[PDB]
């Protein structure tokens, strides 16, 4: 158990969207990990009201460390993705009675929201994101202006 070597690495998972595949990988000392390869779905959660749903991810539109990952549509941690917005819209209509915040009510009728990945599906085994709302929504709208 747990020897040491000098200098090497391994090949990344660098997962995509479409044809979700999960490959298990051997971990020394419990917690047998899972590399997600080309995963197309994810668990996405509202921050304020606190409701998750599994949702088809549409695509990552921003990455803060490599712009080429947005071109290749790579799902790492801390990215900006679009998903569906419809089950969160369904819960919103069902349990608030509004049947529609300002800058997310403007995103509802646009159709797709923005969220942040918090798992590491290259190593963990699943993808989760929470829908950005508040000052995170402010700086990421400024990051949309940094896009345009």
């Amino acid at each position: 158990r747990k020897k040491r070597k000098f200098e090497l690495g391994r090949q990344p998972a660098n997962t995509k969207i479409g044809a979700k595949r999960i490959h298990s990988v051997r971990t020394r000392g419990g917690n047998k990990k899972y590399r997600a390869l080309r995963i197309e779905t994810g668990n996405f959660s509202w921050a304020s009201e606190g409701i998750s749903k599994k949702t088809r991810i549409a695509g990552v539109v921003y990455h803060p460390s490599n712009n080429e990952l947005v071109r290749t549509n790579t799902l790492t941690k801390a990215a900006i993705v679009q998903i569906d917005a419809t089950p969160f819209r369904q819960w919103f209509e069902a349990h608030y009675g509004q049947t529609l915040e300002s800058s997310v009510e403007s995103q509802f009728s646009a159709g797709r929201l923005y969220a942040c990945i918090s798992s590491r599906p290259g190593q963990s085994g699943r993808c989760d994101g929470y829908i950005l709302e508040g000052e995170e929504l402010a700086f990421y709208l400024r990051r949309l202006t940094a896009k345009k």
Partner: protein, 137 residues
Amino acid sequence: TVQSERAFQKQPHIFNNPKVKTSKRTKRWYKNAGLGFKTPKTAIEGSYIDKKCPFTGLVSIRGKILTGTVVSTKMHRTIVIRRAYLHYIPKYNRYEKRHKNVPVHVSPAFRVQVGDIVTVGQCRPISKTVRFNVVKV
């Protein structure tokens, strides 16, 4: 100025709710470092991020507490400390002089002056060579 990177400066698992309101914008987390080290109000109400702060970040100080003096601040968010301890080997029969150098992680909640005396604590590894952490000047 706070934001200085392509990524948003995140302090995870602690976030405000927009429907509730306070004059803090995030339930800002702070901790006392221990061994009598006391957090300052400038470090508390400073809205700096510092994910490697030993009062508000993720790291916790423990064990060794050394002293030293600042020799340079010519690195981005890391400082270098000197220790010119008095030294004696019996081959010399005299109080000879050496010096010991180390890099120490630094926080944006504290002024830095080349020459003043800093009290430094031991923490987890932070860089390739930075292992310690500033806790108090």
